Amino acid sequence: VDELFDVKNAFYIGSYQQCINEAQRVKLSSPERDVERDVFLYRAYLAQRKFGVVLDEIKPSSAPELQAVRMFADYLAHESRRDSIVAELDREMSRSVDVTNTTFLLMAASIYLHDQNPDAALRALHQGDSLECTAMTVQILLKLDRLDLARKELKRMQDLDEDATLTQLATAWVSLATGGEKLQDAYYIFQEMADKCSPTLLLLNGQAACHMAQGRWEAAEGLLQEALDKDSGYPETLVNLIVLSQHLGKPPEVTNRYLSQLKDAHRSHPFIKEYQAKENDFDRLVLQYAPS
Amino acid sequence: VDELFDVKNAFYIGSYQQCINEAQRVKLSSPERDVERDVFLYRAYLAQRKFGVVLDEIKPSSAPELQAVRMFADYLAHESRRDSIVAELDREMSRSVDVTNTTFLLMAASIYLHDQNPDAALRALHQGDSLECTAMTVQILLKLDRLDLARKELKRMQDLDEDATLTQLATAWVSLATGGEKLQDAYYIFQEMADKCSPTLLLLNGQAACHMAQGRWEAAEGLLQEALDKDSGYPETLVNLIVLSQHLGKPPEVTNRYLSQLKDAHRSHPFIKEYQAKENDFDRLVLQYAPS
Amino acid sequence: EGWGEDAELQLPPFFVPPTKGTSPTQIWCNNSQLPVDHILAGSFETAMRLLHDQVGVIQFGPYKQLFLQTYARGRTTYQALPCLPSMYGYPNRNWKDAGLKNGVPAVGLKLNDLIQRLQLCYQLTTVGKFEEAVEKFRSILLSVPLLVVDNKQEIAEAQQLITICREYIVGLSVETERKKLPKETLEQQKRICEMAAYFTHSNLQPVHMILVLRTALNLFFKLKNFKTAATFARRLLELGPKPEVAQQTRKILSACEKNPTDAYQLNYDMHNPFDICAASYRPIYRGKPVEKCPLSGACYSPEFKGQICRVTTVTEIGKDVIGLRISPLQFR
Amino acid sequence: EGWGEDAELQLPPFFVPPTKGTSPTQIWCNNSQLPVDHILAGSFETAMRLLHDQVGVIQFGPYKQLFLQTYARGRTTYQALPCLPSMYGYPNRNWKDAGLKNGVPAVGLKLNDLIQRLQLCYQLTTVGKFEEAVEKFRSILLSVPLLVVDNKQEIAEAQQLITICREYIVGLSVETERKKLPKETLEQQKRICEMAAYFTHSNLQPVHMILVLRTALNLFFKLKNFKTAATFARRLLELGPKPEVAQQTRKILSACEKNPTDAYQLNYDMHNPFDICAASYRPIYRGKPVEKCPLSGACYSPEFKGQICRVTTVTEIGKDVIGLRISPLQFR
């Protein structure tokens, strides 16, 4: 049995503080596990947007796996340095990588995904052999609308470990994208993880998305309100409430409030930029039918 | 020796036209015989369903024996008058009958048998002393499934005249009903009469019934086909072919053809009515196990 | 019904990053010809092309709110792995059997949502807030081509709803212009009465037609056109006004019949059907030439063909179009 | 072996029309407990009672042809005296030693008559006329309880024959329903493949199981479930198909082994025995609860207990019965 089971589980379902708390309590039964624990501790600080902790405490003497988390911390924290980090990352990958260092590949692929470079991120993850590497591949293939390829990688995880948390999560993502009878499958996975662990912002909107997909808007309202009470700034809640609001017949002043609220979510969800782009696309097309 | 031997023999074995032909040729060696000949002449016309001949030619001046044939002719010819004829017949019998007029008693009993009144018919025949009266009693007792009583009346005929045609015929009917070793006895009687006289529809099916009783279906097929070629409408052939057909493995479309053919036999054999009754009994019992 | 083609065995026909599949918003566009589905898909150009050919839109500026708010309800979002860009979900209306290729997006504006908003429009009208009622009416009107609707009777209702919004918008437009005009000259007052009488032929709800007949009854009584004023009074009374207004109307009527003479020839025909030019506010008598709004049915005198309809504010007067499309029914 | 009771002398213990004796058809009923003997006797109610207790019949409508045609072969007829109602003969099967009281009627349907009809059933199946094969199969099935049979081995064969007719009737029922179902949705195609795979576990003749494996091989190959499709191919090949189909199958197999992956989880277990629910066409895995047809062995999921078996069309699913009776042997 895996001494870090609770730690990794808390992280992947979005319960970052519980991850941080339980990482600081476990007993050091190895130096291999010791570094692995620290990786999740610091990725949890990344997830809480506390890049200063990650950046100050991982030193040049720190383990290679931690150097990889710190690389990712630099990129998220320092917008001006991003292009130069990616340039160096391309040079590393072209030179030589330790393929057994799955932590480095997930940190490489994390950087590429943010840099809107899924080919590079898949090219890195292809080199690794680990469950999160597959799980991250499933997510990227789903974003590429290749549900066919996603199913094959998910099937890999199902043969290796049906009951693992990443496999359940990947099953839910694959099911949410397949639709039909499978939307209920995804819902119960998200529910079962909420009622074993704790109903995090990630699981709350996970569940709401499965309701909204079956058109069950009223059943989704409770979940989004609970998510809103926990954290007024989690953007996915705000976006989902815009959808839910309109499907419940509420006034456009509510959709407008959630749009202004989303500009201060200070978590970098693309929705506002795509919205402003569609503002600009529309202004441009108006002048195409009537050049004033 | 009996001048009317050939005439009566032709009638009783079902060779009606030969009876009619030989009755018109014999020389009038009495007035007693003269009337007796006419009785068989007209009963042969009855047997050919030519009731008009019997009805037109027997006048109110005609001999009493002929009045009795004409009574029977009226009943067979005029369905609407049957209940009233039987009513009058009951009144006659209750009033006074000439007991020596065996022709009247056989005509009375013939009417009652058709009117489904065997008690009345036996009550009439009881009063007569003649070979056909006994022979007709044997037949009625066999229909009443009283083979015990039939054997005693047959024994009466055997002591009086072993070689008579009615005694042979009664022996065959009694044997056909006793079964076992006696079925072969009946067969040879029917055969011996066919190969002295002529193989009539009555003798052909007589023989076939003796084969079918011993399970010798293939030996019966020749006889029924010969009977069918002679007269497509004789019902007993049609019924026997339904039995024979199934015991030879032929398709149900053959049993169906003989059933539709039997509706136009226009000779009043009960088989179709009993069949339709069993159609109705079945429809009724289906609703008893499942009241729709 | 043999063994079939289901029984015949057929012809079996580095690292490379994979290529994208079609997005679910593109699937929406492929499978739908209704404007709202393309807007939910984020395909504004194809949506505008559809509205243009079907219903006659050329000035799309006044659609900006509808378009953008519709776009915002098109996709849900959920986080997969921590610290990676979130996922999007594309809820389909035929979700039970949508599959990969056949989806078409969930329905977010229903016809009864609009029919319900008619009531706030009516109240606003009754209390006199014409500028706000017109704004609310036009919003219902422009929203109708964003519907998705199941059966032939809802297509009928959605059309009647458009016609209701038109009737009110042009009627209230007449009244608001009558109030901006000067009442000094005799000839100026004659023009005001005409407009008050035109408004009398708008097809509104009885409670509102009572108010416009009351208005026409005053102006024609002050003009001393008592023959025509009397028939406004008889028509007001037949709608069944509240008791106080019946009494004020009966007194004005029996005064009209004691002098049933019109002082002036006005350009208003009682016994002659017409449509109200929704730009110049003059009558167009049923035989004469008209150019129409291809969505609302607003009538215009022919000078205005090619201009932007004053009622809808977005359509081309007199353009020939396919017709409103708001249901799969219409694509047999 | 003395002089015995054969030597002891014992106690010696108007016009009246006589009374009827027992009819020979009543003698048949007294001496027999087999349904066909009571039908030949014209005793339909007692025949139905026997079929009900022994084999589970409640809906006797579909027996009408069999019953009536059987009735018609029961008695011969011959004329005695001219112009009087004809006689009836009642041919007995034990005619050599029947006597008055012990007769029992002649045998008109033999087991080999039925075994011969199996061939036309098989041909009809091979050429694809499923509706006509099912009709012909069910006729054999309902005819088995009308047999009269001599020894224990024929009772065995008659049971196997019933089981053969059942296997075909439910299998063909699966295929005919698979062909009525739509193939549009992915989820719809998954359901079709399942049914094609269930049919693969029907116990038919090899020439027919080759056709159903060919069908299952196409549908699973088109689905891109190559791991399961490969085992259909290996099983098809082991039955020994004609050379052209072996070649088409070998090519499909070596393509499956070059990618031995199933794309979808279907509800079909290769390594797990089940029975096919003959009403809902879903698998019932050998441990789970079943209600059965008491004559044919058709399996049903428990919801259906008390209903009319879809296979035989005349029996009660799950009724407890004595068991088929078609021989004097079974009444020791």
Short mmCIF file of C-alpha atoms in Angstrom, two decimals, chain B residues 9-281:
data_model
loop_
_atom_site.label_atom_id
_atom_site.label_comp_id
_atom_site.label_asym_id
_atom_site.label_seq_id
_atom_site.Cartn_x
_atom_site.Cartn_y
_atom_site.Cartn_z
CA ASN B 9 -79.30 -58.71 -52.96
CA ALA B 10 -78.44 -55.79 -55.26
CA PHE B 11 -80.28 -53.39 -52.94
CA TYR B 12 -78.74 -54.46 -49.62
CA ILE B 13 -75.13 -54.29 -50.90
CA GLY B 14 -75.72 -50.79 -52.32
CA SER B 15 -75.97 -51.65 -56.03
CA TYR B 16 -79.10 -49.62 -56.53
CA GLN B 17 -79.12 -49.36 -60.32
CA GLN B 18 -78.69 -53.10 -60.75
CA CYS B 19 -81.62 -53.51 -58.36
CA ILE B 20 -83.71 -51.10 -60.45
CA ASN B 21 -82.72 -52.84 -63.71
CA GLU B 22 -83.42 -56.35 -62.46
CA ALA B 23 -86.71 -55.35 -60.83
CA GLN B 24 -88.03 -54.08 -64.15
CA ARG B 25 -87.16 -57.47 -65.83
CA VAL B 26 -88.67 -60.15 -63.59
CA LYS B 27 -91.93 -61.89 -64.58
CA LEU B 28 -95.06 -61.32 -62.48
CA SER B 29 -95.51 -64.78 -60.91
CA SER B 30 -97.93 -63.55 -58.14
CA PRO B 31 -99.60 -60.37 -56.81
CA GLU B 32 -97.82 -60.79 -53.47
CA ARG B 33 -94.43 -60.89 -55.16
CA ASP B 34 -95.59 -58.15 -57.52
CA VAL B 35 -95.95 -55.65 -54.65
CA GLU B 36 -92.75 -56.89 -52.98
CA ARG B 37 -90.79 -56.19 -56.16
CA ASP B 38 -92.22 -52.69 -56.37
CA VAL B 39 -91.19 -52.01 -52.76
CA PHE B 40 -87.53 -52.68 -53.58
CA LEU B 41 -87.76 -50.81 -56.87
CA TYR B 42 -88.87 -47.70 -55.03
CA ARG B 43 -86.53 -48.13 -52.03
CA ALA B 44 -83.75 -48.25 -54.62
CA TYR B 45 -84.96 -44.92 -56.03
CA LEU B 46 -84.91 -43.60 -52.43
CA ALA B 47 -81.34 -44.79 -52.10
CA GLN B 48 -80.40 -42.86 -55.29
CA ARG B 49 -81.96 -39.73 -53.74
CA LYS B 50 -84.61 -39.74 -56.53
CA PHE B 51 -87.55 -38.99 -54.21
CA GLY B 52 -89.56 -37.50 -57.06
CA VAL B 53 -89.97 -40.93 -58.65
CA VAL B 54 -91.15 -42.44 -55.39
CA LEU B 55 -93.43 -39.49 -54.60
CA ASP B 56 -95.08 -39.15 -58.01
CA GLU B 57 -95.69 -42.82 -58.75
CA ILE B 58 -97.06 -44.18 -55.45
CA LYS B 59 -100.65 -43.04 -55.47
CA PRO B 60 -103.41 -43.22 -52.83
CA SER B 61 -104.65 -46.37 -54.60
CA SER B 62 -101.23 -48.03 -54.21
CA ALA B 63 -100.62 -51.02 -51.96
CA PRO B 64 -100.06 -50.42 -48.24
CA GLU B 65 -96.42 -51.56 -48.42
CA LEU B 66 -95.84 -48.84 -51.03
CA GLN B 67 -97.62 -46.24 -48.86
CA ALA B 68 -94.93 -46.95 -46.30
CA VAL B 69 -92.09 -46.35 -48.74
CA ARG B 70 -93.86 -43.16 -49.83
CA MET B 71 -94.14 -42.00 -46.22
CA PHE B 72 -90.37 -42.39 -45.88
CA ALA B 73 -89.90 -40.63 -49.21
CA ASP B 74 -91.89 -37.62 -47.96
CA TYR B 75 -89.72 -37.39 -44.83
CA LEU B 76 -86.38 -37.51 -46.69
CA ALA B 77 -87.56 -35.08 -49.37
CA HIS B 78 -89.35 -32.43 -47.32
CA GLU B 79 -87.37 -31.14 -44.33
CA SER B 80 -90.16 -28.72 -43.38
CA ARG B 81 -92.67 -31.62 -43.03
CA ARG B 82 -90.51 -33.96 -40.88
CA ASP B 83 -91.74 -32.99 -37.42
CA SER B 84 -95.34 -33.28 -38.57
CA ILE B 85 -94.77 -36.68 -40.20
CA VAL B 86 -93.17 -38.02 -37.03
CA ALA B 87 -96.07 -36.63 -34.98
CA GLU B 88 -98.51 -38.52 -37.20
CA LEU B 89 -96.31 -41.62 -37.07
CA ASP B 90 -96.44 -41.62 -33.28
CA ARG B 91 -100.23 -41.44 -33.49
CA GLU B 92 -100.40 -44.37 -35.95
CA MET B 93 -98.20 -46.60 -33.85
CA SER B 94 -100.17 -45.78 -30.71
CA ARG B 95 -103.46 -46.54 -32.50
CA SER B 96 -102.98 -49.80 -34.40
CA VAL B 97 -100.46 -51.27 -36.85
CA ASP B 98 -100.54 -54.36 -39.03
CA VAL B 99 -97.70 -56.30 -37.43
CA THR B 100 -97.35 -58.61 -40.42
CA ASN B 101 -96.57 -55.60 -42.64
CA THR B 102 -92.82 -55.69 -42.09
CA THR B 103 -92.36 -53.17 -44.89
CA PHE B 104 -94.29 -50.59 -42.83
CA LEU B 105 -92.27 -51.27 -39.68
CA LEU B 106 -88.92 -50.87 -41.52
CA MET B 107 -90.21 -47.64 -43.02
CA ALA B 108 -91.39 -46.54 -39.58
CA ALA B 109 -88.06 -47.46 -37.99
CA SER B 110 -86.16 -45.82 -40.85
CA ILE B 111 -87.97 -42.54 -40.12
CA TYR B 112 -87.32 -42.77 -36.38
CA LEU B 113 -83.61 -43.51 -36.84
CA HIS B 114 -83.26 -40.36 -38.95
CA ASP B 115 -85.27 -38.49 -36.33
CA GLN B 116 -82.64 -39.63 -33.79
CA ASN B 117 -85.19 -41.79 -31.94
CA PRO B 118 -83.76 -45.30 -31.64
CA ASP B 119 -86.15 -46.26 -28.85
CA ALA B 120 -89.14 -45.71 -31.13
CA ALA B 121 -87.42 -47.50 -34.00
CA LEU B 122 -86.61 -50.54 -31.85
CA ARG B 123 -90.14 -50.49 -30.45
CA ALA B 124 -91.48 -50.73 -33.99
CA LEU B 125 -89.06 -53.38 -35.19
CA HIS B 126 -89.75 -55.45 -32.12
CA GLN B 127 -93.25 -56.10 -33.50
CA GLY B 128 -92.13 -57.61 -36.77
CA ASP B 129 -90.88 -61.04 -37.72
CA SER B 130 -88.55 -60.84 -40.73
CA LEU B 131 -84.86 -61.05 -41.56
CA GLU B 132 -84.41 -57.38 -42.41
CA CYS B 133 -86.21 -56.46 -39.18
CA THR B 134 -83.59 -58.41 -37.25
CA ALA B 135 -80.80 -57.06 -39.43
CA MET B 136 -81.98 -53.50 -38.80
CA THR B 137 -82.14 -54.30 -35.09
CA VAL B 138 -78.51 -55.51 -35.16
CA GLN B 139 -77.47 -52.19 -36.73
CA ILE B 140 -79.34 -50.11 -34.18
CA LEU B 141 -77.97 -52.10 -31.23
CA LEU B 142 -74.46 -51.65 -32.61
CA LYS B 143 -74.97 -47.87 -32.77
CA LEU B 144 -76.12 -48.03 -29.15
CA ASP B 145 -72.79 -49.73 -28.29
CA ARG B 146 -74.68 -52.77 -27.10
CA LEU B 147 -72.57 -55.34 -28.90
CA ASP B 148 -73.84 -57.87 -26.34
CA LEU B 149 -77.48 -57.44 -27.45
CA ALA B 150 -76.39 -57.26 -31.11
CA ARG B 151 -74.77 -60.69 -30.89
CA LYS B 152 -78.02 -62.24 -29.66
CA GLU B 153 -80.08 -60.87 -32.53
CA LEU B 154 -77.36 -61.85 -34.99
CA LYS B 155 -77.45 -65.34 -33.52
CA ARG B 156 -81.16 -65.41 -34.33
CA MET B 157 -80.38 -64.73 -38.00
CA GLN B 158 -77.61 -67.34 -38.06
CA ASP B 159 -79.92 -70.11 -36.86
CA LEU B 160 -82.64 -69.16 -39.38
CA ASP B 161 -80.54 -68.63 -42.57
CA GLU B 162 -76.72 -68.71 -42.40
CA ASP B 163 -76.20 -68.01 -46.10
CA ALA B 164 -78.60 -65.07 -46.52
CA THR B 165 -77.17 -61.74 -47.62
CA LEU B 166 -78.53 -59.88 -44.59
CA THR B 167 -76.98 -62.46 -42.27
CA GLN B 168 -73.56 -62.13 -43.87
CA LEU B 169 -73.83 -58.33 -43.71
CA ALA B 170 -74.88 -58.41 -40.07
CA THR B 171 -72.00 -60.77 -39.35
CA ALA B 172 -69.63 -58.24 -40.90
CA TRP B 173 -71.07 -55.33 -38.87
CA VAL B 174 -70.88 -57.39 -35.69
CA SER B 175 -67.34 -58.46 -36.50
CA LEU B 176 -66.17 -54.93 -37.40
CA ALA B 177 -67.33 -53.90 -33.92
CA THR B 178 -65.80 -56.83 -32.05
CA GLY B 179 -62.32 -56.37 -33.48
CA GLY B 180 -59.30 -58.51 -32.96
CA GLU B 181 -59.31 -61.72 -34.95
CA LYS B 182 -62.83 -60.95 -36.22
CA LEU B 183 -61.79 -57.97 -38.34
CA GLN B 184 -60.37 -60.39 -40.87
CA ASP B 185 -63.70 -62.27 -40.84
CA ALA B 186 -65.57 -59.08 -41.74
CA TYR B 187 -63.08 -58.25 -44.50
CA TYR B 188 -63.56 -61.55 -46.32
CA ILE B 189 -67.35 -61.25 -46.10
CA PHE B 190 -67.20 -57.84 -47.75
CA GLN B 191 -64.69 -59.18 -50.25
CA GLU B 192 -66.72 -62.28 -51.02
CA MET B 193 -69.78 -60.16 -51.75
CA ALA B 194 -67.82 -57.74 -53.92
CA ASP B 195 -66.37 -60.62 -56.05
CA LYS B 196 -69.72 -62.40 -56.49
CA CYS B 197 -71.66 -59.26 -57.33
CA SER B 198 -69.90 -55.94 -58.07
CA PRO B 199 -67.65 -53.78 -55.90
CA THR B 200 -70.06 -51.02 -54.82
CA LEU B 201 -69.27 -47.88 -52.86
CA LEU B 202 -70.69 -49.59 -49.79
CA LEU B 203 -68.55 -52.72 -50.11
CA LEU B 204 -65.41 -50.73 -51.02
CA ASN B 205 -65.53 -48.69 -47.80
CA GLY B 206 -66.71 -51.74 -45.91
CA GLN B 207 -63.45 -53.43 -46.89
CA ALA B 208 -61.35 -50.32 -46.28
CA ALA B 209 -62.71 -50.07 -42.73
CA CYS B 210 -61.51 -53.60 -42.01
CA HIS B 211 -58.03 -52.77 -43.27
CA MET B 212 -57.88 -49.51 -41.35
CA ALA B 213 -58.92 -51.28 -38.17
CA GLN B 214 -55.95 -53.64 -38.42
CA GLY B 215 -53.70 -50.67 -39.07
CA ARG B 216 -53.14 -51.73 -42.67
CA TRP B 217 -53.42 -48.22 -44.11
CA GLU B 218 -51.51 -48.84 -47.36
CA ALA B 219 -53.78 -51.80 -48.25
CA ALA B 220 -56.76 -49.51 -47.79
CA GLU B 221 -55.54 -46.85 -50.20
CA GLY B 222 -56.45 -48.78 -53.32
CA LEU B 223 -60.05 -49.36 -52.21
CA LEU B 224 -60.73 -45.74 -51.28
CA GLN B 225 -59.23 -44.49 -54.58
CA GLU B 226 -61.48 -46.91 -56.50
CA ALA B 227 -64.46 -45.64 -54.49
CA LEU B 228 -63.48 -42.05 -55.22
CA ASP B 229 -63.31 -42.67 -58.97
CA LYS B 230 -66.84 -44.16 -58.97
CA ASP B 231 -68.49 -41.29 -57.06
CA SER B 232 -66.71 -38.10 -55.95
CA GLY B 233 -69.56 -37.34 -53.56
CA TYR B 234 -70.03 -40.45 -51.46
CA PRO B 235 -69.19 -39.03 -47.99
CA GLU B 236 -67.92 -42.18 -46.28
CA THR B 237 -65.11 -42.29 -48.85
CA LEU B 238 -64.21 -38.67 -48.04
CA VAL B 239 -64.19 -39.29 -44.28
CA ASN B 240 -62.12 -42.46 -44.64
CA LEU B 241 -59.61 -40.59 -46.83
CA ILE B 242 -59.13 -38.01 -44.06
CA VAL B 243 -58.24 -40.88 -41.72
CA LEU B 244 -56.08 -42.67 -44.31
CA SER B 245 -54.31 -39.45 -45.39
CA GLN B 246 -53.03 -38.67 -41.94
CA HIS B 247 -51.91 -42.23 -41.26
CA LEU B 248 -49.82 -42.06 -44.46
CA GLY B 249 -48.05 -38.80 -43.52
CA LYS B 250 -49.64 -36.58 -46.14
CA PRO B 251 -49.73 -32.76 -45.78
CA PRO B 252 -52.55 -31.07 -43.85
CA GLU B 253 -53.63 -29.45 -47.12
CA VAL B 254 -54.97 -32.87 -48.10
CA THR B 255 -57.06 -33.29 -44.96
CA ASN B 256 -58.26 -29.74 -45.69
CA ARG B 257 -59.27 -30.58 -49.27
CA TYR B 258 -61.35 -33.57 -48.13
CA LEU B 259 -63.03 -31.38 -45.51
CA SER B 260 -64.04 -28.77 -48.09
CA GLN B 261 -65.03 -31.55 -50.49
CA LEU B 262 -67.23 -33.07 -47.80
CA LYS B 263 -69.32 -29.88 -47.47
CA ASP B 264 -70.61 -30.56 -51.03
CA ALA B 265 -71.10 -34.32 -50.60
CA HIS B 266 -74.83 -33.28 -50.48
CA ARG B 267 -75.51 -36.62 -48.79
CA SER B 268 -76.43 -36.09 -45.16
CA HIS B 269 -73.52 -37.69 -43.28
CA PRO B 270 -73.16 -36.23 -39.76
CA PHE B 271 -69.39 -35.75 -39.91
CA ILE B 272 -69.32 -32.08 -40.89
CA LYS B 273 -71.85 -31.07 -38.24
CA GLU B 274 -69.99 -32.93 -35.49
CA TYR B 275 -66.79 -31.31 -36.79
CA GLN B 276 -68.29 -27.83 -36.60
CA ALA B 277 -69.58 -28.67 -33.12
CA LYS B 278 -66.07 -29.62 -32.07
CA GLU B 279 -64.93 -26.34 -33.60
CA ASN B 280 -67.37 -24.60 -31.26
CA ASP B 281 -66.50 -26.74 -28.23
#
